[PDB]
């Protein structure tokens, strides 16, 4: 129920299902963006995954234990978005990040645009390590999208 | 609401992928609710 890999986050009531996001299972912990789940509990097969840590400002949440993803973008190299869009199989998109320049420092950012339910898809370095999650970003003047490479701290 | 997860694949870098997208340099702010906005 907590096997390593990338997962879709789905919701259903009485009728069909909707993909609201994506996340990463690593070291027994599920990692996604806060806006995907609003910090609510998740079902995994027959089991229940309870939120353990989260931070609205970073837009992140972890389930079953503390945040485990600690790889960082090296500030130089191309990365891959492992996009898991609603209704489509996982696909890798390589890109050279741009930069969000903030008062508190620079954050890598990817100019790749996918449906809202792609939120939480992992961004990878060349070793396959997850350097952050896709889906907290901004809309630029022409309507296109830029996502931060959002990474949490491994305490 | 039944919010649930389903496996979608292994996490692997794909060799010989073609680079795409640009590399924008943007001035942004982040508020306490986790929203980014452009500084203009």
């Amino acid at each position: 129920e907590t096997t390593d890999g990338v997962y879709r986050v789905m919701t259903r009531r009485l009728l069909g299902s909707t993909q609201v996001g994506v996340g990463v299972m690593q070291e027994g912990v599920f990692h996604t963006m806060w806006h995907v789940t609003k910090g609510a509990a998740l079902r995994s097969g027959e089991g229940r995954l309870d939120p353990y840590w989260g931070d609205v400002k970073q837009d992140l949440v972890s389930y079953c234990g503390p945040w485990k993803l600690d790889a960082a973008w090296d500030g130089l190299s191309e990365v891959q978005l492992l996009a898991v869009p609603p209704g489509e199989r996982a696909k890798n998109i390589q890109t050279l990040p741009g930069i969000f320049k903030t008062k508190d420092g620079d954050i890598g950012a990817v100019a790749l645009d996918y449906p809202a339910g792609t939120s939480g898809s992992p961004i990878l370095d060349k070793c396959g390590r997850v350097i952050g999650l896709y889906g907290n970003g901004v809309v630029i003047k022409n309507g296109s999208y830029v996502s931060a490479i959002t990474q949490g701290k491994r305490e | 609401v039944d919010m649930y997860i389903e496996r979608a694949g292994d996490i692997t870098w794909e060799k010989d992928a073609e680079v795409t997208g640009n590399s924008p340099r943007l001035d942004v702010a982040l508020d306490e609710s986790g929203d980014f906005s452009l500084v203009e």
């Binding site: 449906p115 970003g137 | 980014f36």
Partner: peptide, 4 residues
């Protein structure tokens, strides 16, 4: 974005 289909910001989120």
């Amino acid at each position: 974005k289909g910001x989120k």
